[PDB]
Design a protein around this nucleic acid. Structure first.
Ligand SMILES: CC(=O)c1cccc(N[C@H]2[C@H](N)[C@@](NC(=O)N(C)C)([C@H](C)O)[C@@](C)(O)[C@@]2(O)COC(=O)c2c(C)cccc2O)c1
Ligand SMILES: [K+]
Ligand SMILES: [Mg+2]
Ligand SMILES: [Mg+2]
Ligand SMILES: [Mg+2]
Ligand SMILES: [Mg+2]
Ligand SMILES: [Mg+2]
Ligand SMILES: [Mg+2]
Ligand SMILES: [Mg+2]
Ligand SMILES: [Mg+2]
Ligand SMILES: [Mg+2]
Ligand SMILES: [Mg+2]
Ligand SMILES: [Mg+2]
Ligand SMILES: [Mg+2]
Ligand SMILES: [Mg+2]
Ligand SMILES: [Mg+2]
Ligand SMILES: [Mg+2]
Ligand SMILES: [Mg+2]
Ligand SMILES: [Mg+2]
Ligand SMILES: [Mg+2]
Ligand SMILES: [Mg+2]
Ligand SMILES: [Mg+2]
Ligand SMILES: [Mg+2]
Ligand SMILES: [Mg+2]
Ligand SMILES: [Mg+2]
Ligand SMILES: [Mg+2]
Ligand SMILES: [Mg+2]
Ligand SMILES: [Mg+2]
Ligand SMILES: [Mg+2]
Ligand SMILES: [Mg+2]
Ligand SMILES: [Mg+2]
Ligand SMILES: [Mg+2]
Ligand SMILES: [Mg+2]
Ligand SMILES: [Mg+2]
Ligand SMILES: [Mg+2]
Ligand SMILES: [Mg+2]
Ligand SMILES: [Mg+2]
Ligand SMILES: [Mg+2]
Ligand SMILES: [Mg+2]
Ligand SMILES: [Mg+2]
Ligand SMILES: [Mg+2]
Ligand SMILES: [Mg+2]
Ligand SMILES: [Mg+2]
Ligand SMILES: [Mg+2]
Ligand SMILES: [Mg+2]
Ligand SMILES: [Mg+2]
Ligand SMILES: [Mg+2]
Ligand SMILES: [Mg+2]
Ligand SMILES: [Mg+2]
Ligand SMILES: [Mg+2]
Ligand SMILES: [Mg+2]
Ligand SMILES: [Mg+2]
Ligand SMILES: [Mg+2]
Ligand SMILES: [Mg+2]
Ligand SMILES: [Mg+2]
Ligand SMILES: [Mg+2]
Ligand SMILES: [Mg+2]
Ligand SMILES: [Mg+2]
Ligand SMILES: [Mg+2]
Ligand SMILES: [Mg+2]
Ligand SMILES: [Mg+2]
Ligand SMILES: [Mg+2]
Ligand SMILES: [Mg+2]
Ligand SMILES: [Mg+2]
Ligand SMILES: [Mg+2]
Ligand SMILES: [Mg+2]
Ligand SMILES: [Mg+2]
Ligand SMILES: [Mg+2]
Ligand SMILES: [Mg+2]
Ligand SMILES: [Mg+2]
Ligand SMILES: [Mg+2]
Ligand SMILES: [Mg+2]
Ligand SMILES: [Mg+2]
Ligand SMILES: [Mg+2]
Ligand SMILES: [Mg+2]
Ligand SMILES: [Mg+2]
Ligand SMILES: [Mg+2]
Ligand SMILES: [Mg+2]
Ligand SMILES: [Mg+2]
Ligand SMILES: [Mg+2]
Ligand SMILES: [Mg+2]
Ligand SMILES: [Mg+2]
Ligand SMILES: [Mg+2]
Ligand SMILES: [Mg+2]
Ligand SMILES: [Mg+2]
Ligand SMILES: [Mg+2]
Ligand SMILES: [Mg+2]
Ligand SMILES: [Mg+2]
Ligand SMILES: [Mg+2]
Ligand SMILES: [Mg+2]
Ligand SMILES: [Mg+2]
Ligand SMILES: [Mg+2]
Ligand SMILES: [Mg+2]
Ligand SMILES: [Mg+2]
Ligand SMILES: [Mg+2]
Ligand SMILES: [Mg+2]
Ligand SMILES: [Mg+2]
Ligand SMILES: [Mg+2]
Ligand SMILES: [Mg+2]
Ligand SMILES: [Mg+2]
Ligand SMILES: [Mg+2]
Ligand SMILES: [Mg+2]
Ligand SMILES: [Mg+2]
Ligand SMILES: [Mg+2]
Ligand SMILES: [Mg+2]
Ligand SMILES: [Mg+2]
Ligand SMILES: [Mg+2]
Ligand SMILES: [Mg+2]
Ligand SMILES: [Mg+2]
Ligand SMILES: [Mg+2]
Ligand SMILES: [Mg+2]
Ligand SMILES: [Mg+2]
Ligand SMILES: [Mg+2]
Ligand SMILES: [Mg+2]
Ligand SMILES: [Mg+2]
Ligand SMILES: [Mg+2]
Ligand SMILES: [Mg+2]
Ligand SMILES: [Mg+2]
Ligand SMILES: [Mg+2]
Ligand SMILES: [Mg+2]
Ligand SMILES: [Mg+2]
Ligand SMILES: [Mg+2]
Ligand SMILES: [Mg+2]
Ligand SMILES: [Mg+2]
Ligand SMILES: [Mg+2]
Ligand SMILES: [Mg+2]
Ligand SMILES: [Mg+2]
Ligand SMILES: [Mg+2]
Ligand SMILES: [Mg+2]
Ligand SMILES: [Mg+2]
Ligand SMILES: [Mg+2]
Ligand SMILES: [Mg+2]
Ligand SMILES: [Mg+2]
Ligand SMILES: [Mg+2]
Ligand SMILES: [Mg+2]
Ligand SMILES: [Mg+2]
Ligand SMILES: [Mg+2]
Ligand SMILES: [Mg+2]
Ligand SMILES: [Mg+2]
Ligand SMILES: [Mg+2]
Ligand SMILES: [Mg+2]
Ligand SMILES: [Mg+2]
Ligand SMILES: [Mg+2]
Ligand SMILES: [Mg+2]
Ligand SMILES: [Mg+2]
Ligand SMILES: [Mg+2]
Ligand SMILES: [Mg+2]
Ligand SMILES: [Mg+2]
Ligand SMILES: [Mg+2]
Ligand SMILES: [Mg+2]
Ligand SMILES: [Mg+2]
Ligand SMILES: [Mg+2]
Ligand SMILES: [Mg+2]
Ligand SMILES: [Mg+2]
Ligand SMILES: [Mg+2]
Ligand SMILES: [Mg+2]
Ligand SMILES: [Mg+2]
Ligand SMILES: [Mg+2]
Ligand SMILES: [Mg+2]
Ligand SMILES: [Mg+2]
Ligand SMILES: [Mg+2]
Ligand SMILES: [Mg+2]
Ligand SMILES: [Mg+2]
Ligand SMILES: [Mg+2]
Ligand SMILES: [Mg+2]
Ligand SMILES: [Mg+2]
Ligand SMILES: [Mg+2]
Ligand SMILES: [Mg+2]
Ligand SMILES: [Mg+2]
Ligand SMILES: [Mg+2]
Ligand SMILES: [Mg+2]
Ligand SMILES: [Mg+2]
Ligand SMILES: [Mg+2]
Ligand SMILES: [Mg+2]
Ligand SMILES: [Mg+2]
Ligand SMILES: [Mg+2]
Ligand SMILES: [Mg+2]
Ligand SMILES: [Mg+2]
Ligand SMILES: [Mg+2]
Ligand SMILES: [Mg+2]
Ligand SMILES: [Mg+2]
Ligand SMILES: [Mg+2]
Ligand SMILES: [Mg+2]
Ligand SMILES: [Mg+2]
Ligand SMILES: [Mg+2]
Ligand SMILES: [Mg+2]
Ligand SMILES: [Mg+2]
Ligand SMILES: [Mg+2]
Ligand SMILES: [Mg+2]
Ligand SMILES: [Mg+2]
Ligand SMILES: [Mg+2]
Ligand SMILES: [Mg+2]
Ligand SMILES: [Mg+2]
Ligand SMILES: [Mg+2]
Ligand SMILES: [Mg+2]
Ligand SMILES: [Mg+2]
Ligand SMILES: [Mg+2]
Ligand SMILES: [Mg+2]
Ligand SMILES: [Mg+2]
Ligand SMILES: [Mg+2]
Ligand SMILES: [Mg+2]
Ligand SMILES: [Mg+2]
Ligand SMILES: [Mg+2]
Ligand SMILES: [Mg+2]
Ligand SMILES: [Mg+2]
Ligand SMILES: [Mg+2]
Ligand SMILES: [Mg+2]
Ligand SMILES: [Mg+2]
Ligand SMILES: [Mg+2]
Ligand SMILES: [Mg+2]
Ligand SMILES: [Mg+2]
Ligand SMILES: [Mg+2]
Ligand SMILES: [Mg+2]
Ligand SMILES: [Mg+2]
Ligand SMILES: [Mg+2]
Ligand SMILES: [Mg+2]
Ligand SMILES: [Mg+2]
Ligand SMILES: [Mg+2]
Ligand SMILES: [Mg+2]
Ligand SMILES: [Mg+2]
Ligand SMILES: [Mg+2]
Lengths: 48, 275
RNA sequence: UGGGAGAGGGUGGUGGAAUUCCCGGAGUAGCGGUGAAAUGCGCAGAUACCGGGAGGAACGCCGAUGGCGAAGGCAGCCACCUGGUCCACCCGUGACGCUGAGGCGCGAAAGCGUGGGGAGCAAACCGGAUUAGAUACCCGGGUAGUCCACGCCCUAAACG
RNA sequence: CCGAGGGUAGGGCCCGUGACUGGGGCGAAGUCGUAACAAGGUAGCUGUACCGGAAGGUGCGGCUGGAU
RNA sequence: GCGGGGUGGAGCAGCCUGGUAGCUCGUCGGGCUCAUAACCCGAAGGUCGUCGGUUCAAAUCCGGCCCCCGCAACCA
RNA sequence: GAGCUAGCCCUGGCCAGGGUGAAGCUGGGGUGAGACCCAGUGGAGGCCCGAACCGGUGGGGGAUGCAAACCCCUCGGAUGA
RNA sequence: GAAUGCCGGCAUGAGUAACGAUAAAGAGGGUGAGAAUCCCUCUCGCCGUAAGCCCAAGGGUUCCUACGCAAUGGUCGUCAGCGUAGGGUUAGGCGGGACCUAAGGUGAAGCCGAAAGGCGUAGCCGAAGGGCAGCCGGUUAAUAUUCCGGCCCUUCCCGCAGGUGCGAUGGGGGGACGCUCUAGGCUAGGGGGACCGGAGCCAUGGACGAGCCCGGCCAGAAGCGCAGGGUGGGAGGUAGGCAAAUCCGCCUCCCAACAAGCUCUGCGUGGUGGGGAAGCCCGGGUGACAACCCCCCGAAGCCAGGGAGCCAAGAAAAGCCUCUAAGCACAACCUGCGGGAACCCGUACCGCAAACCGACACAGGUGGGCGGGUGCAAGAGCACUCAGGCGCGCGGGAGAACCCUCGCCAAGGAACUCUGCAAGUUGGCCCCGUAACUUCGGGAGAAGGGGUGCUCCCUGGGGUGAUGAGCCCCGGGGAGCCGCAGUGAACAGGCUCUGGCGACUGUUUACCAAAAACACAGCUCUCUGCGAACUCGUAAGAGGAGGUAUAGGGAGCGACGCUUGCCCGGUGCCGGAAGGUCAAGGGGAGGGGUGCAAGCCCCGAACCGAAGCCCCGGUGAACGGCGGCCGUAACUAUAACGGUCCUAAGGUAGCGAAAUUCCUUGUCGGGUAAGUUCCGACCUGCACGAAAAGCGUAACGACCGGAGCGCUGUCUCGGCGAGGGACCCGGUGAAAUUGAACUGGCCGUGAAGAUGCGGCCUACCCGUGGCAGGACGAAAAGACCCCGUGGAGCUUUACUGCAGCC
RNA sequence: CGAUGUCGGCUCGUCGCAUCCUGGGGCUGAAGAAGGUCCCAAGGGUUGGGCUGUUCGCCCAUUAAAGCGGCACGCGAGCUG
């Protein structure tokens, strides 16, 4: 049946993307934390 | 009038539709229409603030002239009478001799082809607009400004009218559609005559679908809900109110008056409404 | 052809008297109601009086044993639209007439549907009396309805 | 081929019968009240409407077959 | 299982707050009436469901027995 | 976090074929005029039958599954809320 | 040594279940160490409104070629979407961007918020909508509207010529719009041809034929032709379109108008360029100088911004055209022609699936277009089949039980069972025919019935053409033929009577309930006079609504019919400048502390003093509520009648053993051989009753009762048969569970149900197929119950606060 | 209570005997026939249907008879629900 993951490149980028994160106080703390933890990706991989 | 149907489906049985007899023009002035931004009862927060709304037929807003003192003394011919989906009343197209074209709501018996005008000196005749101070006591009247230059506010719905009852100082005394007795300032414009399409209220929607076409989504009773939802929610099997009948938000809904007591306009309302 | 009287009918308008309610005024110990009372209303200022307003319904005197209509029925006043009917003249048509099973229309009140309207009155209903009782008669309230528009109902001591 | 009639299916009219139910007629001396006839003690009657144990009551309009 | 009830012939007060039994109707006698009802004047009839106790004193307070009504009897 | 799901907003798309035959219109009849009757024309509808599509009624299977909701048969809606 | 401990390893179950749609295989020939599994050929089967083809998402090298087979692949593997390497994606015209706007987002100005931030006109961003110029063929192992060929086109820049008041982010027009139905004419597509082209072919009884088989086109500028869309022309006035305006709008005048003219598309034609089959040879050659013609059917597509009808009344902005303002009129712009210039990103491949979403090469999910033929009334249905694509990545035998899916069945026919559950029956079209009841539409496919193929003959009408031939569509009539049977296969209602509930189509517990539940048109009450009420928000701001009492919020009821009684004492709400109570504050009688005193300081009575409450009224489609005992009629029985207590008032009409009735299977009647259910009645209604509506009601229902007909493997009562498994052999090979086990019966005993203790009995050792009585078998630290001064949701006249409102 | 699945039905039985029938008896208010009552006897047998979820019961039509109990109210790793 219709499952929950329905990939959409625009959706992905517009929701979890770098510019979404930077626009919001909480979005920025995510970047700060993932940077502090040393994540190789700060933001979901989407091919634009 | 209102027109019936033969019962050839269960719904056509009771359904009735307006006769549209008075209509003479079936598409609007391109220069006088703009798109009506449908809300779905949602506010700028995105939240529903008026329950049960949405999904009605698409509509263009017809810009209406609710001022009239805009064009004192300049006469106009009544070009057509048209359908307006945004209000109960019908509307009349006016071709001013100015060249300018405007919409007004069409008073009862207003005739396509006749002449109307606005100002202190206008003849007391259907379609004319005058400050209330110049309109003879006893005349039925509509599209009444409530305060000078602020726009026609009162008696705009189909078949409605306010009647001038008398004068006092700079104010005139009106009997509103609701039956309330109110002082309105004499400089306030008003159009003489009642609003047309009085048979509006006699329309029988006939089926649920018709509500849906008007953007009216189903209303679900409080008694039909759960306690998390509503004062009347819950109960094993059916239940009476079991408390004074209340709104979804808890306030009482049979009798509880709700207009602010200390409202400044109280000084201008002579007698609370009719029946 | 020329004239007549008339609440005949339909529409639009409109006049004053009275009731009720509202407002201002002035005023105080009761008012109302009956066979008698009580319920009811009244010092939160009623009744009685003056002024202003709102609204509905009905048209006093004229008015009669009167008039008009086929009947039911028709009454302030104005205008318009319309029917019936009588008199005179003795001009025209030349029996073109009487009645009338069916059919069709009209048809008081009450009642019914949709909308409006609602002052007074008032089935139902409530209360106070009376009474053995009083689901009555009397008294105080009172909703349909009584009024308008449209559509139904089609009854009658619709009687001379 | 037609054909008495047999069969299948469904209608129509009539008669009989039916738990129960509706009022009707009648029946020597039952209970309740007293609506009508004398203004019958609220003149009666009336079409309609609503109400009431019952006669009846009341509203609206009508009739005199009532007033004396 | 819990609550209330029993008192002239009928239906109800009095019980809680011990002493003092009342109200309407019914019944009986007498009036009015030609007569009955209505109405008016008088009168009788309850020792209080029963037994036991408390008390100077019990319809009344406390217990047992008879009854008479209500309410309850849920989770499987 | 509304890429599942619920509502709404904007902009697009889809719904084989068959059936029934409303209003109106035309003519005829009818009458003082009407109402109205008949025929033809017409093509309405949360109308009917039924694919796509949307469902998920009953039963059977499956039950360490093909599948953490599926499969077969049957069934609802299918111009509409 | 234990914690259903944690991490890891390795056992058991076990060579067991399984190897993922029952569309299906067989052989020959290659290759290789090795072949059911790779390649080739022939035969067989399956999909064909797809299981074929093309897009868009998403995926991201999986594409092509060489070399490989450790692992991945449910077996095998020489093969592969796997490993290694090399190669492969070409655009002014396709898509997106250097264009436009939609919701929405963002946001100069401005508004608001402790901070973070929230909002907000314009503007900007935002597309699968608007707008915009490329078609046919050829080529690669792999890209192609991109490369090549042929024929077309767009914009930008510069120049030349001609024309003009040129000029805009401003004014105006236009773009520009719904649903259903639909005319004319075309194209796409398809059918036939005795016509044109073509290798060949004559079999097995016959046919050298008007035989069979194959094919008979594609694109194309200017011009022309056919069909259509769009559009009046002139002049005078002019205050309106936030300046101006010759434009547009309004008035007047002349002209002409299902036309015309002008303009714009579609289709046909068209110089030119391409394509071009079967078959037979080795994807290529040939065929072939291939032919390329007529007839019919014909779109949902095109002309398209067409027409009609309807109500629910159907985006914006740019491109474009016109108007003028600054300006500028050596400039500028329009038309024509020429040369030049023309960027960025995508392009491979999968794409209803082994490459996407589902942990898997997973019977699930996934938007748009094309989707051939024949027959069946139609069609995208159904059977077969074209093009094309497949046989589903374990096989080989066997022919048990039992399971699944399927077929048939003697006599009976619901006797099955909670229940006709299930499965039969019926079944399309044509005609005849069709009841109660009804809101007049319906009930209706009611019920029930007849027909249905093939052949010959006669005949009617329509389409195209021409008015005829042919082709195509719709019929009528007569005579015959055959079989068990003519919708001969496939797809395709069983029906009726009578209740309950809900009027109805709809909606719902994704994943145990589809319903009588929710919704619904409609009815009533109530708030709301507009800066409305109400809702979200601390606010600004929004929604309500660019609406205005015929409107908007809340509540109950639920089409429609006939109706909806009595109670206002309590709660609610509504009205009531009196009175009572009442907080802060006002007032300060009279005290008190301190000081030598002026003074400073503290308590403080009467009174005045809001809402709220009290108090007085109203109010039921507001919350709600609507009695008890005793007696009484000339047979009895019963009680129209009376008495008395109590209430705020004592349940009206209608209905009633009911979706409600305890006693209860009440009683009687119906139906049945027999009826705790059903239906109709009665009424001591434990415990109906009038908008938590009452009683009815045509139609409707995958709702729940009861009955009958039809028909049946449901059953008496089972039998046989098919396929897929189960079984055997080769390949691969799990699982929960498991203290260890050398793990019998009885009767006892034991913590009360013993393989394990006692006594007796029985019993050689080990498996395989089966059945499920036990191992208080597995699973899940019972979901019931209780306990915990454990939690959570929900309620209220529990307590105590808070928002909000006064 | 770190789970002993709970009514009835269906299927499949097996056992007890306080015996429903069949067999053997004594007493009888046993004439015969048919009964009553008690004793011995568990080998075999003990029907089909209507109603209800029902066990049970009542009813219909039969019968030699239409027995009563246990087996976790026997039996859901056997089915139903
Ligand atoms: C004095 C008087 O007229 C009076 C007195 C007492 C009572 C009554 N009752 C009268 C009672 N109020 C009565 N009439 C009434 O009020 N009127 C204004 C006429 C009733 C309400 O309709 C009546 C008809 O019962 C009554 O008129 C007749 O009763 C008697 O006449 C009456 C009775 C019944 C008993 C004794 C005397 C009577 O008159 C009246
Ligand atoms: K429980
Ligand atoms: Mg999606
Ligand atoms: Mg996207
Ligand atoms: Mg997205
Ligand atoms: Mg982003
Ligand atoms: Mg790194
Ligand atoms: Mg992130
Ligand atoms: Mg209608
Ligand atoms: Mg109109
Ligand atoms: Mg516009
Ligand atoms: Mg916003
Ligand atoms: Mg936001
Ligand atoms: Mg709201
Ligand atoms: Mg809403
Ligand atoms: Mg309108
Ligand atoms: Mg609408
Ligand atoms: Mg609702
Ligand atoms: Mg509820
Ligand atoms: Mg609920
Ligand atoms: Mg919630
Ligand atoms: Mg609540
Ligand atoms: Mg409740
Ligand atoms: Mg409830
Ligand atoms: Mg209940
Ligand atoms: Mg309740
Ligand atoms: Mg309550
Ligand atoms: Mg409340
Ligand atoms: Mg409020
Ligand atoms: Mg008011
Ligand atoms: Mg005073
Ligand atoms: Mg003469
Ligand atoms: Mg009449
Ligand atoms: Mg009348
Ligand atoms: Mg009547
Ligand atoms: Mg009336
Ligand atoms: Mg008397
Ligand atoms: Mg009495
Ligand atoms: Mg009244
Ligand atoms: Mg015979
Ligand atoms: Mg009398
Ligand atoms: Mg009388
Ligand atoms: Mg009398
Ligand atoms: Mg009398
Ligand atoms: Mg009585
Ligand atoms: Mg009365
Ligand atoms: Mg006890
Ligand atoms: Mg006492
Ligand atoms: Mg005491
Ligand atoms: Mg005492
Ligand atoms: Mg005598
Ligand atoms: Mg004593
Ligand atoms: Mg004593
Ligand atoms: Mg409980
Ligand atoms: Mg989404
Ligand atoms: Mg499609
Ligand atoms: Mg027709
Ligand atoms: Mg005619
Ligand atoms: Mg339909
Ligand atoms: Mg299913
Ligand atoms: Mg689904
Ligand atoms: Mg089935
Ligand atoms: Mg499952
Ligand atoms: Mg399935
Ligand atoms: Mg199926
Ligand atoms: Mg179906
Ligand atoms: Mg259908
Ligand atoms: Mg359809
Ligand atoms: Mg729609
Ligand atoms: Mg230890
Ligand atoms: Mg473990
Ligand atoms: Mg092993
Ligand atoms: Mg083995
Ligand atoms: Mg095993
Ligand atoms: Mg196996
Ligand atoms: Mg499998
Ligand atoms: Mg191999
Ligand atoms: Mg091999
Ligand atoms: Mg091969
Ligand atoms: Mg096909
Ligand atoms: Mg097929
Ligand atoms: Mg991937
Ligand atoms: Mg390998
Ligand atoms: Mg190898
Ligand atoms: Mg290998
Ligand atoms: Mg492997
Ligand atoms: Mg392998
Ligand atoms: Mg696999
Ligand atoms: Mg090799
Ligand atoms: Mg490649
Ligand atoms: Mg190019
Ligand atoms: Mg550039
Ligand atoms: Mg752009
Ligand atoms: Mg933009
Ligand atoms: Mg600022
Ligand atoms: Mg943009
Ligand atoms: Mg954006
Ligand atoms: Mg775009
Ligand atoms: Mg558009
Ligand atoms: Mg483009
Ligand atoms: Mg081209
Ligand atoms: Mg190459
Ligand atoms: Mg210019
Ligand atoms: Mg411009
Ligand atoms: Mg538009
Ligand atoms: Mg073409
Ligand atoms: Mg064809
Ligand atoms: Mg040849
Ligand atoms: Mg001008
Ligand atoms: Mg200007
Ligand atoms: Mg070739
Ligand atoms: Mg050649
Ligand atoms: Mg059009
Ligand atoms: Mg429409
Ligand atoms: Mg200048
Ligand atoms: Mg110059
Ligand atoms: Mg030019
Ligand atoms: Mg660039
Ligand atoms: Mg490419
Ligand atoms: Mg693939
Ligand atoms: Mg596979
Ligand atoms: Mg798959
Ligand atoms: Mg097709
Ligand atoms: Mg067919
Ligand atoms: Mg296969
Ligand atoms: Mg396989
Ligand atoms: Mg075998
Ligand atoms: Mg058989
Ligand atoms: Mg049968
Ligand atoms: Mg049979
Ligand atoms: Mg049966
Ligand atoms: Mg049944
Ligand atoms: Mg069948
Ligand atoms: Mg069939
Ligand atoms: Mg019938
Ligand atoms: Mg009918
Ligand atoms: Mg049939
Ligand atoms: Mg044949
Ligand atoms: Mg069918
Ligand atoms: Mg029933
Ligand atoms: Mg329903
Ligand atoms: Mg329902
Ligand atoms: Mg109902
Ligand atoms: Mg309904
Ligand atoms: Mg539907
Ligand atoms: Mg569910
Ligand atoms: Mg659930
Ligand atoms: Mg769930
Ligand atoms: Mg469920
Ligand atoms: Mg289910
Ligand atoms: Mg469901
Ligand atoms: Mg359903
Ligand atoms: Mg629901
Ligand atoms: Mg209603
Ligand atoms: Mg808030
Ligand atoms: Mg707030
Ligand atoms: Mg707005
Ligand atoms: Mg509004
Ligand atoms: Mg509302
Ligand atoms: Mg509802
Ligand atoms: Mg009350
Ligand atoms: Mg009160
Ligand atoms: Mg009250
Ligand atoms: Mg103070
Ligand atoms: Mg009553
Ligand atoms: Mg009963
Ligand atoms: Mg019964
Ligand atoms: Mg019964
Ligand atoms: Mg009950
Ligand atoms: Mg019962
Ligand atoms: Mg019963
Ligand atoms: Mg019972
Ligand atoms: Mg019985
Ligand atoms: Mg019987
Ligand atoms: Mg039942
Ligand atoms: Mg019954
Ligand atoms: Mg009884
Ligand atoms: Mg009820
Ligand atoms: Mg209620
Ligand atoms: Mg009912
Ligand atoms: Mg019905
Ligand atoms: Mg009816
Ligand atoms: Mg239904
Ligand atoms: Mg249903
Ligand atoms: Mg069988
Ligand atoms: Mg087999
Ligand atoms: Mg394991
Ligand atoms: Mg051992
Ligand atoms: Mg023991
Ligand atoms: Mg033992
Ligand atoms: Mg041991
Ligand atoms: Mg031992
Ligand atoms: Mg031992
Ligand atoms: Mg031993
Ligand atoms: Mg032994
Ligand atoms: Mg076992
Ligand atoms: Mg066991
Ligand atoms: Mg489990
Ligand atoms: Mg536990
Ligand atoms: Mg648990
Ligand atoms: Mg505690
Ligand atoms: Mg404790
Ligand atoms: Mg704890
Ligand atoms: Mg706690
Ligand atoms: Mg809590
Ligand atoms: Mg336990
Ligand atoms: Mg365990
Ligand atoms: Mg347990
Ligand atoms: Mg366990
Ligand atoms: Mg004997
Ligand atoms: Mg035996
Ligand atoms: Mg039984
Ligand atoms: Mg029983
Ligand atoms: Mg015997
Ligand atoms: Mg037991
Ligand atoms: Mg058991
Ligand atoms: Mg058991
Ligand atoms: Mg089980
Ligand atoms: Mg069981
Ligand atoms: Mg078990
Ligand atoms: Mg077990």
């Amino acid at each position: 049946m219709k499952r929950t993951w329905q990939p959409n490149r625009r959706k992905r980028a517009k929701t979890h993307g770098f510019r979404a994160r930077m626009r919001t106080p909480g979005g920025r703390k995510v970047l700060k934390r993932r940077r502090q933890k040393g994540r190789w990706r700060l933001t979901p991989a989407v091919r634009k | 009038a209102v027109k019936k149907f033969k019962p050839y489906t269960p719904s056509r049985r009771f359904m009735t539709v307006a006769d549209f007899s008075e209509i003479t023009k079936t598409e609007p002035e391109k220069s006088l229409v703009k798109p009506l931004k449908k809300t779905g009862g949602r506010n700028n927060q995105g939240r529903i603030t008026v329950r049960f709304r949405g999904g009605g037929h698409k509509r263009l807003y017809r810009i209406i002239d609710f001022k009239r003192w805009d064009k004192v003394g300049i006469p106009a011919k009544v070009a057509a009478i048209e359908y307006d989906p945004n209000r109960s009343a019908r509307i009349a197209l006016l071709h001013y001799v100015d060249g300018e074209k405007r919409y007004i709501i069409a008073p009862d018996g207003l005739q396509v082809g006749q002449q109307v005008v606005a100002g202190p000196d206008a003849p007391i005749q259907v379609g004319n607009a005058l400050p209330l101070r110049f309109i003879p006591v006893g005349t039925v009247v509509h599209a009444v400004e409530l305060e000078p230059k602020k726009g026609a506010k009162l008696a705009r719905a189909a078949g409605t009218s306010a009647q001038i009852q008398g004068r006092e100082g700079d104010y005139v005394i009106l009997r509103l559609p609701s039956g309330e007795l109110r002082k309105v300032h004499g400089e306030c414009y008003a159009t003489v005559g009642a609003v047309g399409n009085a048979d509006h209220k006699n329309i029988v929607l006939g089926k649920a679908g018709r509500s849906r076409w008007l953007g009216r989504r189903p209303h679900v009773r409080g008694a039909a809900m759960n306690p998390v939802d509503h004062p009347h929610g819950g109960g094993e099997g059916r239940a009476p109110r079991g408390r004074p009948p209340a709104s979804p938000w808890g306030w009482q809904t049979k009798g509880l008056k709700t207009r602010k007591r200390r409202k400044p306009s109280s000084r201008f309302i002579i007698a609370r409404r009719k029946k």
